Amino acid sequence: ANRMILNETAWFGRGAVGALTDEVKRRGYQKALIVTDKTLVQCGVVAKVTDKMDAAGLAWAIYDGVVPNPTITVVKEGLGVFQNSGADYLIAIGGGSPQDTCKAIGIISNNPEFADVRSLEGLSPTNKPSVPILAIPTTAGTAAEVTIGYVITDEEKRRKFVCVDPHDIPQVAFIDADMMDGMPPALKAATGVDALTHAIEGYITRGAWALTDALHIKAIEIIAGALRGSVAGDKDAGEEMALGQYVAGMGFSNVGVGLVHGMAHPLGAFYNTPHGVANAILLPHVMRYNADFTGEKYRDIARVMGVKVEGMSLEEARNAAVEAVFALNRDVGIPPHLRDVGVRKEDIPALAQAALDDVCTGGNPREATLEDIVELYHTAWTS
Amino acid sequence: ANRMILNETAWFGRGAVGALTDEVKRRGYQKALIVTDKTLVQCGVVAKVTDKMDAAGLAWAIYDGVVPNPTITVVKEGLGVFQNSGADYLIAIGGGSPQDTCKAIGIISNNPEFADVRSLEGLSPTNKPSVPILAIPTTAGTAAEVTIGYVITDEEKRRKFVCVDPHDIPQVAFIDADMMDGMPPALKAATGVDALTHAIEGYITRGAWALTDALHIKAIEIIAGALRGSVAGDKDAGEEMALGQYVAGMGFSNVGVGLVHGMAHPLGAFYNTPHGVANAILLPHVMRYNADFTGEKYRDIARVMGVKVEGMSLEEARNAAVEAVFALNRDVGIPPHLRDVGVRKEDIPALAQAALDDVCTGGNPREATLEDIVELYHTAWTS
Ligand SMILES: Nc1ncnc2c1ncn2[C@@H]1O[C@H](COP(=O)(O)OP(=O)(O)OC[C@H]2O[C@@H](O)[C@H](O)[C@@H]2O)[C@@H](O)[C@H]1O
Ligand SMILES: Nc1ncnc2c1ncn2[C@@H]1O[C@H](COP(=O)(O)OP(=O)(O)OC[C@H]2O[C@@H](O)[C@H](O)[C@@H]2O)[C@@H](O)[C@H]1O
Ligand SMILES: COc1ccc(CC(N)=O)cc1OC
Ligand SMILES: COc1ccc(CC(N)=O)cc1OC
Ligand SMILES: [Fe+3]
Ligand SMILES: [Fe+3]
């Protein structure tokens, strides 16, 4: 028997944030804490929301202390600001980093036992729902607005840990490509292939079933078709990417992912590597590694990614789907090897250990050994 | 900007009702009123739930006063039983009739200004969320467990009225084919083609967009592929039907349907016709009427319904999709003509008026006139 956690309410398309003032008035909320980062404030992205809230007469304080790969320190700082703001709800504005930080604050606020943060790892045994969250992504992205997962960095144990908890699901998501247009091309490409990694990994994960298969294959189709266009700055392509990344979240949240995310998390913890860039470099190599344990699913991936698989053997089709991902990586300007983003050969043993102990690795369709992950890192490292 | 209302939590597959006791304990609810009908009690379908609740020690009273095409009288009776039960939440067990009745009780309970019931018609301006509903369907399917819509019969004005309200969305849906297996073949076929009508109408509705298109086309594929098998009594086909009917609900709830539902509602009000039988007889005739206003969408329908469209013109493909639905109706034992279920030529003028004033008619891709609907009824009436 399979469980689906989704957003009760979500708005999609350009101008979707225009619905926020109305959703807040419907629920009777009094004051927001906006969780965001400094970049989004001084790009005027936060202003696009706070201007509408001022016009609607809705009170808000702001915490913009979030950094890429949010730390336990960041979570504690924000939790402190939330308590002193007298706010009764949360508005996450940004990529995975502010949205994951927002979820941590929301959970600990109503489950104060978890103030240390690192005790949220795995299936968080929280008694109480999160402080209500309204989620507004600015990356096409991590689907943080719809997933029941969030990833915090333990600076002292030098690892990223996943917390999975139905209590952290946002009440409303606003998926507005107007909020995402300010992404630099490199960021559109990184977060774009993070979305594709969620969809491919989710499609082949051990817990996969009919409904998540249907969602993931549609998300791969939307992302493969739109990402080149979005990175180039096309407006309609940006709107497609915004939807594609969300539809991936509806799936992988509820069944899981695999060794790509398992091997990407240690890279973030060790080097502060952008999550999408780590994922994008590993994805094709892990896809090749997983090929023989995926049944017919690489034929479907290859097809919706624009490959003619009419009269291909299964191994030829599996190779074609891997090659489709290498090509898309090349076109959107992602460095092809881990060496290129500052990963060090010396660390691979330690990284392979952390990858094997990651929550995401358990979902991988092929049972990965330390020997295998060490070899994968080395394959992804070279040149 | 498009809004999606979905279930925050849902369980799918045989044994899914096994998750109900746990969901109730998580939320801290004290006593249920089970809304159902007499048939489901004395078929032991309700027992499959209440036995698990007794084992978990969870209190419940029962209202089984629901009849096909539930009336304002039924709603008032149930609202009375709810008030005298001291219950704090609702469990809907049955098809569209109990589930729609449950939503009416839940809404009026917390929005008591709507005690007349008929003032819920259209976009219900309710201030308060429904009394929490846990939804367990026993038909395949009206998708009442996931839609924000419900249909009540006004005995005094002899018309069915649709109420659309995000506040009525159930907290949890349990989609268990074990609960649906006792459906007689005729009921599997009726509710089966009601699910197909939701998917086809939803696919071509005026408000249709990318995400609902993706959901509806997958639901048509699941239903076309499984309905003959389910009517024959196949267990796995019943499980597919259970998912297919739900996936249709995820779409049509959020964008609407068309003139099939518009023309089916008056038939229920006048003759107490089973909703699915009325829908199934009208669907192919309304599909023909709509054909020129649907873009490429009948090519997609035809394809996922098992028709080879590789080298077909658009008009030939549109004709093939209409013929696919006539054939599926023939195979599951739905008669071709409205005369066959007791519709009277004398009433067509009155029925055409009621159809034009139905909420669902506004979604129809071709703007329907009274003259047109009169002609459609006559076309659907006899050969
Ligand atoms: N619209 C935007 N315009 C400009 N800069 C932006 C925009 N959105 C985000 N940025 C900037 O991009 C950088 C990356 O932001 P993140 O929130 O880290 O982006 P994302 O890739 O969505 O998040 C990754 C995070 O999600 C988790 O799942 C994962 O483990 C990782 O911690 C930051 O400097 C942020 O301010
Ligand atoms: N598993 C089952 N086994 C046997 N009989 C069943 C089962 N489930 C339902 N029934 C019986 O089928 C008959 C029809 O039940 P409904 O609830 O009316 O069926 P459904 O088609 O799901 O609902 C139609 C209603 O919903 C609205 O969408 C529509 O406008 C109409 O009011 C009733 O006698 C009911 O007891
Ligand atoms: C285990 O599944 C997950 C793995 C990673 C994340 C964070 C992310 N968006 O990449 C969320 C998850 O869902 C619970
Ligand atoms: C207007 O849309 C609807 C019309 C009819 C129903 C009930 C049904 N299942 O036929 C639900 C709806 O969604 C809000
Ligand atoms: Fe990710
Ligand atoms: Fe219906």
Author numbering:
A (entry chain BBB), B (entry chain AAA): 3 to 385
Give me lines lifted from the publication on this model.
Here it is shown which structural adaptations were introduced by directed evolution experiments that changed the catalytic properties of the Escherichia coli (E. coli) (S)-lactaldehyde reductase [EC 1.1.1.77]. This enzyme, referred to as FucO, is also known as an Fe2+, NAD+-dependent group-III alcohol de­hydrogenase and is involved in the catabolism of rare sugars in E. coli.
The mode of binding of NADH in the active site, including the nicotinamide moiety, is well defined by the electron density map, being the same in both structures. Also, crystal structures were obtained of the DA1472 variant in the presence of the bulky substrate analog, compound 7, cocrystallized in the presence of either NAD+ or NADH. The mode of binding of the substrate analog is the same in both structures and well defined by the electron density map. The observed mode of binding of compound 7 is possible because of the N151G and L259V amino acid changes of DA1472. In particular, the side chain of Asn151 of the wild-type active site clashes with the mode of binding of compound 7.
